[PDB]
Design a protein around this ligand. Sequence first.
Ligand SMILES: NC(=O)c1ccc[n+]([C@@H]2O[C@H](COP(=O)([O-])OP(=O)(O)OC[C@H]3O[C@@H](n4cnc5c(N)ncnc54)[C@H](OP(=O)(O)O)[C@@H]3O)[C@@H](O)[C@H]2O)c1
Ligand SMILES: NC(=O)c1ccc[n+]([C@@H]2O[C@H](COP(=O)([O-])OP(=O)(O)OC[C@H]3O[C@@H](n4cnc5c(N)ncnc54)[C@H](OP(=O)(O)O)[C@@H]3O)[C@@H](O)[C@H]2O)c1
Ligand SMILES: O=C(C[C@]1(Cc2ccccc2)[C@H]2C[C@H]3C[C@@H]1C[C@@H](C2)[C@@H]3O)N1CC(O)C1
Ligand SMILES: O=C(C[C@]1(Cc2ccccc2)[C@H]2C[C@H]3C[C@@H]1C[C@@H](C2)[C@@H]3O)N1CC(O)C1
Lengths: 262, 280
Amino acid sequence: EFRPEMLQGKKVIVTGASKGIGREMAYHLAKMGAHVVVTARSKETLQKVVSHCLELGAASAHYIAGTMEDMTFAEQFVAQAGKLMGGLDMLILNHITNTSLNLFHDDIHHVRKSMEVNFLSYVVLTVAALPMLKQSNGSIVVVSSLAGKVAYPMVAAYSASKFALDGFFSSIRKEYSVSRVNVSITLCVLGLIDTETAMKAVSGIVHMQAAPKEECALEIIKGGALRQEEVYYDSSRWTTLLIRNPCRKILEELYSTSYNMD
Amino acid sequence: MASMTGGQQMGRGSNEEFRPEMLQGKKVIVTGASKGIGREMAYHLAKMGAHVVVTARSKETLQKVVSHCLELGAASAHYIAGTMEDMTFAEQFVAQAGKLMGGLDMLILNHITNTSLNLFHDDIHHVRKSMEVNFLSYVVLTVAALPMLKQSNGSIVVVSSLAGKVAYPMVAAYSASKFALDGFFSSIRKEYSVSRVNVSITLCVLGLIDTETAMKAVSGIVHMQAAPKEECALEIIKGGALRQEEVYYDSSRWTTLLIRNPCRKILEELYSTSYNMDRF
Ligand SMILES: NC(=O)c1ccc[n+]([C@@H]2O[C@H](COP(=O)([O-])OP(=O)(O)OC[C@H]3O[C@@H](n4cnc5c(N)ncnc54)[C@H](OP(=O)(O)O)[C@@H]3O)[C@@H](O)[C@H]2O)c1
Ligand SMILES: NC(=O)c1ccc[n+]([C@@H]2O[C@H](COP(=O)([O-])OP(=O)(O)OC[C@H]3O[C@@H](n4cnc5c(N)ncnc54)[C@H](OP(=O)(O)O)[C@@H]3O)[C@@H](O)[C@H]2O)c1
Ligand SMILES: O=C(C[C@]1(Cc2ccccc2)[C@H]2C[C@H]3C[C@@H]1C[C@@H](C2)[C@@H]3O)N1CC(O)C1
Ligand SMILES: O=C(C[C@]1(Cc2ccccc2)[C@H]2C[C@H]3C[C@@H]1C[C@@H](C2)[C@@H]3O)N1CC(O)C1
């Protein structure tokens, strides 16, 4: 069971926290009395986020503006954010490259960029944060999607990147389990959220029910805090009922007895 | 006699039962076909009387697979050596292979970058390279082959793994890229379905196979049973010919029984009714 005091005085990194779910997570963490370091490209909206964080009761609030396309920036940001907070307890990986609904034809640049920003940078950020998280027995939060579990048209590049996250992060969870690395991996499977970017990108196309960004932000924090393997958050109650793969958990349990690292 | 001949090989029962004659005179591309499953697929296709174009880096090894193919009864056998790290090569290979066969009926995407069992630490170059060769090059190959496959109402075969459906330790980068294939290719299948593009997408979920590379990489680390490369190659070809969405091939009968996700098919069916696509 979750408690807001679980985040009181905790050192947290929030990527893609200029707007949407990221900003709401930073706001929730601020109220809980957590130390926060937010990142995105824009040096204006990150300044307006840090001030609203501080007003809500954050233990310390900071920003480091940059682009997650640059792997050197991602690696340097973690070392710098960790320097201001004197450690790290939670790494929230939320950022994505800008995406719109379109049928796939020949946009390889969008496929590559989607892999670089939505996946590759998450891996770079994890490598750079691992020593600090190992020290605090920290948590890694990976913000994914339903398109990261099931197939949907018009988001082919986006689905690839989100699917990779599942494959990469669930594999290293099984590695941390055997090598006794006390760093939890929380993968968040989200449906449509009422963010300004989402509402504009879905308008006219898919007009499904949109879940609130405020509650979405809280469930992600809850999931990470409790050290849950997976968090499911969507408006449809039929989703929650079918999204889980118990056969997958069984197969993984059956294959774990066939390996030797001894 | 081919100018006085004519008709269709896929009739009633073709949808459910495979025939070797389904590949007779078919134009097929086989990537990563210098050894392992790829070579066995090329060999099976040659016996069926198919036109084949094989690729991998090794100019020397590629030559041998071609010679044995023509001896097996292939309609025409060719090779184009090059690395799948170079996106320009991948794009140029398809145009050249299509030129040598006068079209394309099946695109078999089988190649992967060299990979070993190791816990993940800091090897970002292996993560990037795994995405570039195991996934991103498959997407380039697909873009370049799509016009020809649209012409013949062709098939795309994507060779994946169980580690592309469920999580396993020591193959994090490999598993990331085998998962990306599922996400990208299952999404475009749903796009081809609505836009009435008659090009099938066959994703192959394979367990341990007895290839020379696999046996060397898994010794003393993982002790599961390995399945034969010959039969594995045939089941992949079968699925492409039957236009099956997914092919599952493994030693454990408990795998086949649990690997399927019927809840996923149901959810996809439920979400398809919520989208508007009379645009793009
Ligand atoms: N919204 C939904 O319905 C929904 C559904 C499923 C999954 N999700 C997942 O939820 C997460 C957040 O989504 P959201 O809708 O809340 O986001 P959002 O409102 O679109 O915000 C995206 C954030 O990422 C930043 N960003 C964009 N390009 C960047 C780049 N190149 N480098 C670094 N940061 C970059 C943006 O700031 P700057 O432009 O200033 O850089 C912004 O802070 C994502 O991982 C998304 O996949 C959301
Ligand atoms: N064997 C198994 O247990 C198993 C299990 C599940 C899935 N699979 C999948 O089945 C497929 C075949 O596996 P396999 O074990 O048969 O492989 P294999 O014997 O290692 O053959 C790999 C092939 O890819 C080529 N290749 C490697 N790196 C390349 C590069 N950079 N550019 C272009 N071609 C390259 C190789 O030739 P060159 O080195 O000369 O280029 C060779 O033709 C792969 O997709 C694998 O993931 C296999
Ligand atoms: O993943 C998202 C929302 C999308 C992509 C999508 C995925 C599937 C269906 C429609 C759109 C992402 C990428 C992009 C478009 C959408 C809204 C934002 C997040 C962004 O603008 N969904 C909605 C599913 O229930 C899980
Ligand atoms: O996908 C493969 C085989 C592996 C990777 C692996 C995956 C899982 C467990 C052990 C190894 C790939 C990558 C690399 C090592 C293995 C053998 C070759 C293909 C290659 O040399 N499996 C075996 C599972 O049943 C699905």
